[PDB]
């Protein structure tokens, strides 16, 4: 469950002294139920990634309240936020944010090391995750040695490896063809059905937005989606 409450966010850029504000989000309110796939669509540059970065605590809102699973996460320090992310969050990054010095296997395995599961019990988990995203043969590759869609699926696999309660997916199928994207969407829907994982998916694709139980439109920094219908 995500409860974004009247979130305003702005950015400050420019040389010191001549700093200008970049109003990104204005009074953004987003409620995602537990085990629901919320899809956030909007024009490029509307603040969708900013919204996900606020939900995950990558940035702190200029004002507003983010409540995840009932706990106010605004005001978390880096340690509190990192523990919360390890416990509850998987994040699929728009630029896939893979560690260059690790292979595909080591990248997907890193969350399991951070949770300290078992190096022996990690093998089966990472192998199955890589097979689910069609990357069995690329486990030895580095992100240097991957396609954009393969790096995207490494990001997907790293986010889904821990089976978190919330997955924040930042355009998780933009680098994928229709078949690979359909496989990833089927995996997302399977995780949502079976593990009850809450998904917040930014997407520019109509099919990906259609898999969601909720649709939210980001326009002019306003989340005027408010869509919640039965399935």
């Amino acid at each position: 469950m995500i409860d974004v409450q009247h979130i305003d966010h702005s950015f400050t850029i420019g040389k010191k002294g001549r700093e200008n504000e970049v109003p990104v989000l204005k009074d953004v309110s987003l409620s995602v139920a537990k085990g629901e796939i919320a899809c956030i669509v909007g024009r490029s540059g509307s603040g969708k990634s900013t919204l996900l970065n606020l939900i995950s605590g990558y940035i702190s809102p200029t004002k507003g309240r983010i409540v995840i699973n009932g706990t106010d996460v605004t005001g978390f320090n880096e340690k509190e936020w990192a523990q919360f992310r390890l416990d509850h969050f998987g994040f699929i990054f728009q630029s896939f944010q893979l560690i260059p010095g690790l292979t595909t296997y080591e990248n997907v395995e890193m969350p399991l090391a951070l949770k300290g599961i078992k190096p022996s019990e990690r093998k089966q988990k990472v192998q199955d995750m890589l097979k689910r995203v069609g990357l069995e043969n690329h486990a030895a590759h580095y992100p240097n040695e991957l396609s954009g869609g393969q790096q995207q699926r490494v990001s997907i696999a790293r986010a889904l490896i821990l089976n978190p309660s919330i997955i924040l997916a930042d355009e998780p199928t933009g680098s994928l063809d229709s078949e690979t994207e359909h496989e990833v969407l089927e995996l997302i829907q399977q995780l949502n059905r079976e593990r009850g994982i809450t998904f917040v998916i930014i997407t520019h694709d109509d099919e990906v937005a259609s898999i969601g139980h909720s649709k939210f439109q980001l326009h002019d920094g306003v989340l005027k989606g408010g869509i919640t219908v039965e399935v």
């Binding site: 702190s60 880096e78 523990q83 390890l86 944010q97 690790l102 080591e106 951070l114």
Partner: protein, 436 residues
Amino acid sequence: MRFKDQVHFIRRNMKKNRLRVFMTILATTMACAFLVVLSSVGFGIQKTITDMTMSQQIVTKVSVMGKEGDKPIKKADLEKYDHVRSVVERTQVYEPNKATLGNRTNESSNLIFTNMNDELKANMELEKGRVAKSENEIVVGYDFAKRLLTKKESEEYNKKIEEAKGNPEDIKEPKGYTKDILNKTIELSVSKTDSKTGDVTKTKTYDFKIVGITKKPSQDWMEDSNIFISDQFKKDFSEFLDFKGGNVETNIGVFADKFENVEQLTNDLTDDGYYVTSVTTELEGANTFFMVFKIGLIFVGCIAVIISAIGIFNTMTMAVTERTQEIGIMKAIGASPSIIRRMFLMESAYIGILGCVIGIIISYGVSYLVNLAVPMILAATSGGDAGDLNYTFSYIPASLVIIAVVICGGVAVISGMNPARKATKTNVLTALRREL
């Protein structure tokens, strides 16, 4: 995150970043090696100076040739001054003597009555043997054995000297006692003569065991035929030809521990009326030069620590600031900032320990190589004469290795932990974007 997982992932990232890891290891290694090698040259200079002080004894000599308001100079009160390692009073007597080893006799030897313990404390310069420790034992000069001559060659020497007639250039001095004069026994016979009898009066001899040979004077021409007897054997040669001062010459020398105290000692004796010379009055500003040299050594060591620490800081700050995006990814995935800081502390400590170990090995190898090479350079530049100093060009103490390892590894740890701490303290998006 388990310790084994942290080590595994540090190793994997190290393996994929060989240039960066090599740059950091090279910075730490070169810092450690430079610190140890430079400070080892400094330590070797200090060791060479200490050995020169311990051997030469002209460095720390403050010879007293008199006193204002003429009073008999007493050795006991001269040791009361601070930093006086010894006070050697030599009662050089030029009275006739008959030191005989048997078939060969000596006449030109000059008796010297000195406290043997004082000579031992003053580091008496000996070519071979040791300073006399008992009442019977004596130390004789380098040329004492060569002066042991029987009449057979004495006649030849006399005729050769008399036949020169203004050209004593080509004079063949007899080789004398070329055998090992050390650990032998001589018969020192001293006459009474005196004008009241006009002849040889009662005579007494002593059995003296040579134990030491004084250092060979440089430049030749200096016939050191002295023989040194302990002052506990006094009046036993004074009852024969009492010391009226006509020939008896006294040489008092106040020795200092270390050259650093020679100037203070000389000033101390001078304000008390003693007529002293020492090295600091022969060479004006000698103590000042030594102090300026020590200050320069300290300042050079300090700026060397600064340059090595700055090199480590530059390299480690660069290397860990290149990891800011990775730290952001770690924090985003759920790595605690303390876990990331522990991992970067482990990586920095590993880089520092590896670089310090390599630098210490390189330091010992370079020290060995330069201690081999400096004799070669000395032979090449000045020809072959480097057998009279006993220097240490480079000397690495264990304390120097400890201090250099501590400094360089600590700088590596702090310089690799400061940017890591900065990256862990910022929000994730700032690190993911490599700052703003």
